[PDB]
Amino acid sequence: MNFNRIPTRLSTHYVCDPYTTLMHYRRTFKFLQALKAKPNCRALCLGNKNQVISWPKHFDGLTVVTSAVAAQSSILSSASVYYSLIICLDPVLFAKHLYRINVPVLGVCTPREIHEHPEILKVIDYLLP
Amino acid sequence: XXXXXXXXXXXXXXXXXXXXXXXXXXXXXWXX
Amino acid sequence: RQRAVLTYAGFTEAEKLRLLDEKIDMLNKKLDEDYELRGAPQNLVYLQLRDHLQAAKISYREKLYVRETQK
Amino acid sequence: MSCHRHVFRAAPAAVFASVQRWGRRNNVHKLTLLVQTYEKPCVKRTRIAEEKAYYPRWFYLRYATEVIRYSLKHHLRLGQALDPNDDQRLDA
Amino acid sequence: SPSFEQQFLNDKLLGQNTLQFTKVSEKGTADALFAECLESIRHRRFKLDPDVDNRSSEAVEKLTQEERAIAEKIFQRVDPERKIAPRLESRGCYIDPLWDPFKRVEELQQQVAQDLTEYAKLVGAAEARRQRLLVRASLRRQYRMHDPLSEGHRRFFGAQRADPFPTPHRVHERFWDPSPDVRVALKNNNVPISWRDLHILHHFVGENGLILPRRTTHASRYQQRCIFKAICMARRMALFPYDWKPTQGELMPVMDPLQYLVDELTSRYKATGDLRADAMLCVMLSKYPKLNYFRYLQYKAQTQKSEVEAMQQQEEEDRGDFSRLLRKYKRATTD
Amino acid sequence: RAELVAAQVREKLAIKMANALA
Amino acid sequence: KYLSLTQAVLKKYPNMRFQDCYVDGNDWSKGNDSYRADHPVMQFVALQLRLMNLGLDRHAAFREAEQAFYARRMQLEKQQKLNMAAAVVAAAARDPSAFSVPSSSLPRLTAMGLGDVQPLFTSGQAYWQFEIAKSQANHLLRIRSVLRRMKAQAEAAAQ
Amino acid sequence: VRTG
Amino acid sequence: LLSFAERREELAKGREALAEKAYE
Amino acid sequence: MNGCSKRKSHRLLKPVFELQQSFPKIQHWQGAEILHRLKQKEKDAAVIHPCIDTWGDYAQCLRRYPATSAARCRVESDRHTRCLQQHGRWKPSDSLEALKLLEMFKVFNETARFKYPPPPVHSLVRGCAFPFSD
RNA sequence: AGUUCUAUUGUGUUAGCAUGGUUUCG
């Protein structure tokens, strides 16, 4: 059934180990509690159509770039006016757009994704395994 | 008879180990 | 002859004696019922089985007495 | 050697086709063309390098096309990565 | 009262394979007497047997074709040098004797024989012969469907052959998988191949006469070089062809023909037990005492020792069932 | 509407007799 | 280290590849031998490596794992024997006599393991031969039933 | 579940 | 095979079925 | 009683559209040419109809032989009957080219004139703004 | 790394040989 290379080395995942996950939960709980302790603050949630139909495909943050000259422009540029926290479920897909975003980002992803694209740690601020 | 059934059950319980080998695995059946 | 010995090896002497007596009693009841229904059975299956079991029990009693004398 | 085929309860065209297949898989025509004319050693080096680079690609693409045809014939669906930790338990 | 073997096992297919279910004991032994008593009682109970005991269910495909393919691959991996087969003679190794499912088959054959003889007694000999012929025909029809991994089973159940998913023709050496015969040929006898091994060089040469490549022969690089050298030397010595596979008369290894004959007769007497081969080896032992009969003599000694051990065991059992058979379980487990 | 009651009555009798025999 | 431990255990016990042979994840083809974490091979190598970490040699850990899984096999075998003992009475409930002497051999067939509950073996050879024996017995049963039906018809015609 |  | 306690529970469910579905 | 306790999900029992062997990425145009050669050697039967050629041959033979056609045209008649029986309910194939199917698997190597499309974002982005306070 | 031995040699020089394209003879 398989006719490919068989790896000999397995890499551990310290970022998503039990104690690291517990610390992630502890550190994110305080920030979430402090954010909710303040009024009139909205949280955006981003995911993929294949991991969520009912959810709207267009929101205030979305920019919907349509021109070739605007390809480099981010699509979540204006999310900072409306939202105080972006909960992302597809950091690999949204990495180029969450880079240097002016609102805190809480990313949910798998150890495989983290290891295959470690650059997502430069766009994620809080991690929930 | 209930006692005859008990004797048959005792014989089936104090029986050999199915497979004659002393291996370290029980195999299910893939027939049917 | 080996299969019966292997199957009954786990059974202790007392348990085997109880089972033999139970089989003798069941054969007696079955033969009485057959006589009541017909009187003269058309087959001697249970008759021969009961005869063999009784002979075996008598021989086993004699063997136990022989063991007693040996001790 | 010389391939021998017996035309018995079959078509002479079919037997000729089988002989052609034997010749092609043995490269008989290739060798005949090679020996019909002089090939300089450098030309032979280049040709052998080209063949050794080319044919494995052809074999892999042949395997790929065979898989494509089988999947189209049997109406097979694209696979999804096997999610680990799935109990794989019968719903019975 | 003809038995099942007396009635139906004289046919070609039916008589080919005939397993043994019980040890054979000579007349005049406790085992023989107990067997006689059991046979008589079983026949009488077959007379006084009910209808529910002969209920049978319809036959269905035991395995799918893909599952059969998977099972065949796994059995081959279990025994990569030998061919997969239901070695019902070696059955005792895999299934404990006390849990043999063939006792039911033996008793059913006895019951069928008793039924046929009683039918002959009642209706008539001509009708009995008609029914025996019909039962023979039915057994012949159902002979090849019992094995779930055979082609007879597929043909009987009318199942189309599986269409396996395509696999690559050019794969890595890690995955090359030779057949058992090619595997045995390549391994030889743990000895590197020489030109004298004319009985095997035909495997690695194509019908065209060209020596086969390593991707086709599934040989190591060293083995490939050794085989190439052996074939070249044999060709130069004119004992191996140049443009075709060797004729069936060229397959003798380069060695003494009488030693080859001794080897072949030993192989026959071990695999099947040809009494003619045994007699030929017996006469050769004295006529040509310069050959090697070690394996034949060793097998003869093993058989004689096993016979003596069996006789001693029978004597012990006659005196009273001793601890040998009990040990064969308890001591074996303790070890 | 009658087959179900018949079948479950048979099941009741079988279960009762099996329990008694055991 | 599993790459070598699995090879060792498979070479010692080739029959472990039958287990979960139809389950996606266990690739038993030559050159792979990659099983799921819940496969007996994976459990064996995991236990062996755990004992090695605890500080035993490879061979000692191998023997300890073998003993542990033999004990597990014995437990499952005894559970199956209990199920067969239950099935003995379950089938005996079908005898009209119970509803003196039994009037059927079905309890004895169940005891021998040909009834509702069938035995568990260590190798696939055993299941192959078991299925062959089952098919042969069923064909003989059909023949015997037909013969006895003809017997009854002949008796009725004669009377 | 039985043996796996 | 089902244990005796589960057999008793199934018998109780069957008794409830007798009370409700069959008689009424 | 004893039997498999897990689903028979093995990809051999349930073949799936996948390439079970990987291979070093091939130049796109070289792979395209090889696939074209394979298709030409296979002679993909996308003709007007399989039966059209048999009917044409039968009609031509009948026209050539207006008198002894009954005996002359029998191989053609049998061939046309077979073609009608086999490809009578024939529908032209509607599937993607193997070239595109393999671009999906990423078998080929990006050249100057071929690049894999970037992951879609506009179609796949799903946003859900909800209140989070108090 | 080096020296000695060990198992293996599509390496280089070697007397001869088996086979073969080609030409040749009838």
Q: Report the DSSP beta bridge partners of residue J27.
A: J109
Q: Is the CB of E191 under 7 A from strand K?
A: no
* Owner of token pair 């039915």: E138
Element (H, E) at J27: strand J26-27
User: How far is residue A2's CA from residue G32's CA, in Å, rounded to a whole number?
Assistant: 7
Please list, residue by residue across G19-54, b when 16 or more beta carbons sit within 10 angstroms of its beta carbon and e when fewer do: bbbbbbbbbbbebbbbbbebbbbbbbbebbbebbee
Which three-class secondary structure state does DSSP give residue A46? strand
Report DSSP state, residue J6: B
In one-letter notation, the amino acid at residue E43 is H
Nucleotide nearest to E232 (CA to C1'): K18
| Token pair belonging to E298 | 């060793």
Torsion region of E161: left, alpha or beta (phi above 0 gives left; psi -120 to 50 gives alpha): beta
E258: how many CB neighbours lie within 10 A of its CB? 13
**Sequence-ordered strand ranges (E) for J28-93:** none
The full DSSP string for D27-51 is: THHHHHHHHHS---HHHHHHHHHHH
Q: Would you call A10 an interface residue with chain G, using a CB distance cutoff of 8 Å?
A: no
Nucleotide nearest to E242 (CA to C1'): K19
| Token pair belonging to C39 | 């009187």
User: Are G128 and E86 inside 8 Å of each other by CB?
Assistant: yes
Closest chain B residue to H1, measured at CA: B28
Q: How close G93 comes to chain F (CA, Å)?
A: 5
User: How far is residue J96's CA from residue J86's CA, in Å, rounded to a whole number?
Assistant: 24
User: How far is residue E103's CA from residue E100's CA, in Å, rounded to a whole number?
Assistant: 6
**What's the Å distance between residue C59 CA and nucleotide K3 C1'?**
88
Pick among A33, A35, A40, A45 to test the J interface (most J CBs inside 10 A): A45
The full DSSP string for E192-232 is: ---TT-TTTGGGGB-TTSPBPPHHHHT--HHHHHHHHHHHH
Helix %, strand %, coil % of chain H (to 5): 0, 0, 100
User: How far is residue G137's CA from residue G140's CA, in Å, rounded to a whole number?
Assistant: 5
Contacts of J12 in chain A (CB under 8 A): 1
In one-letter notation, the amino acid at residue A81 is V
User: How far is residue B3's CA from residue G102's CA, in Å, rounded to a whole number?
Assistant: 11
Pairing of the two strands A83-88 and A105-107: parallel
Q: How close E240 comes to chain D (CA, Å)?
A: 15
Candidates E104, F13, E107; CA nearest to G115 is: E104
State the greatest distance between any 2 C-alpha atoms of chain G, in Å, as a whole number: 84
E166: nearest CB among D3, D22, D70? D70
What residues have CB less than 8 Å from G85, skipping those under 6 apart?
B9, B12, B13
Burial of E245 (0-12, 13-18, 19+ CB in 10 A): middle
Which three-class secondary structure state does DSSP give residue A48? strand
Burial of E204 (0-12, 13-18, 19+ CB in 10 A): buried
Q: Is the CB of E225 under 7 A from strand K?
A: yes
Candidates C69, J52, G145; CA nearest to E138 is: G145
Q: Which residue is nearest to nucleotide K9 (CA to C1')?
A: E222
Whether E225 and E231 have beta carbons less than 8 Å apart is answered as no
Candidates G90, G115, I12, G95; CA nearest to F18 is: G90
Contacts of F18 in chain G (CB under 8 A): 89-90, 93
Q: How close G27 comes to chain J (CA, Å)?
A: 9
What residues have CB less than 8 Å from G123, skipping those under 6 apart?
B19, B21, B23, B27, E78, E94, G15, G18
User: How far is residue E307's CA from residue C43's CA, in Å, rounded to a whole number?
Assistant: 42
**Alpha-carbon distance values, A81 to A43, A77, A99, E20 (Å):** 11, 9, 17, 89
Nucleotide nearest to E222 (CA to C1'): K8
Contacts of C11 in chain B (CB under 8 A): 10-11, 14
Angle at the Cα of J120 from the Cα atoms of J116 and J123, rounded to 5 degrees: 150
Which three-class secondary structure state does DSSP give residue E108? helix
User: Are G99 and F14 inside 8 Å of each other by CB?
Assistant: no
Burial of J53 (0-12, 13-18, 19+ CB in 10 A): middle
| Token pair belonging to E69 | 């393919």
Question: Helix I4-17 vs helix F3-21: angle between axes, to the nearest 10 degrees?
Answer: 150
Helix ranges (H only) for chain A are 18-36, 79-82, 91-98, 111-116
Please list, residue by residue across E207-216, b when 16 or more beta carbons sit within 10 angstroms of its beta carbon and e when fewer do: ebeebbebee
Q: Would you call G53 an interface residue with chain C, using a CB distance cutoff of 8 Å?
A: no
Report DSSP state, residue E143: G
In one-letter notation, the amino acid at residue G2 is Y
User: Which resolution in angstroms does this entry have?
Assistant: 2.5
Burial of G116 (0-12, 13-18, 19+ CB in 10 A): middle
**What's the Å distance between residue E39 CA and nucleotide K11 C1'?**
80
E181: how many CB neighbours lie within 10 A of its CB? 12
User: Are B14 and C9 inside 8 Å of each other by CB?
Assistant: yes
User: How far is residue E249's CA from residue E198's CA, in Å, rounded to a whole number?
Assistant: 11
Q: How close D78 comes to chain G (CA, Å)?
A: 15
**What's the Å distance between residue A65 CA and nucleotide K26 C1'?**
92
Question: Helix E294-319 vs helix E257-271: angle between axes, to the nearest 10 degrees?
Answer: 20
E1: how many CB neighbours lie within 10 A of its CB? 12
- How big is chain D, counted in residues? 92
Q: Would you call J23 an interface residue with chain D, using a CB distance cutoff of 8 Å?
A: yes
Chains touching chain C, criterion 3+ CB pairs below 8 Å: B, E, G
Candidates G115, E67, J3, I6; CA nearest to D92 is: J3
Q: How close G140 comes to chain C (CA, Å)?
A: 23
What residues have CB less than 8 Å from A8, skipping those under 6 apart?
G3
In one-letter notation, the amino acid at residue C43 is N
Chain K footprint positions (protein CB, under 7 Å): 8-10, 17-21
- Phi and psi (nearest 5°) for E300? -60, -45
Mark residues 28-87 of chain D whose C-beta is closer than 7 A to nucleic acid strand K.
Answer: 35
Contacts of J119 in chain A (CB under 8 A): 93
Q: What dihedral do alpha carbons A33, A38, A40, A41 form, nearest 10°?
A: -40
Please list, residue by residue across J37-47, b when 16 or more beta carbons sit within 10 angstroms of its beta carbon and e when fewer do: ebeeeeeeeee
The number of angstroms, rounded, from the C-alpha of G144 to the middle of its chain's C-alpha atoms is: 28
Q: Is the CB of E198 under 7 A from strand K?
A: no
Pick among B3, B8, B20, B22 to test the G interface (most G CBs inside 10 A): B8
Candidates E265, E324, E271; CA nearest to E291 is: E265
- Residues in J 14-43 with any Cβ partner in G closer than 8 A: 14
The number of angstroms, rounded, from the C-alpha of C42 to the middle of its chain's C-alpha atoms is: 22
B3: nearest CB among C9, C10, C22? C22
Pick among G18, G23, G73 to test the B interface (most B CBs inside 10 A): G73
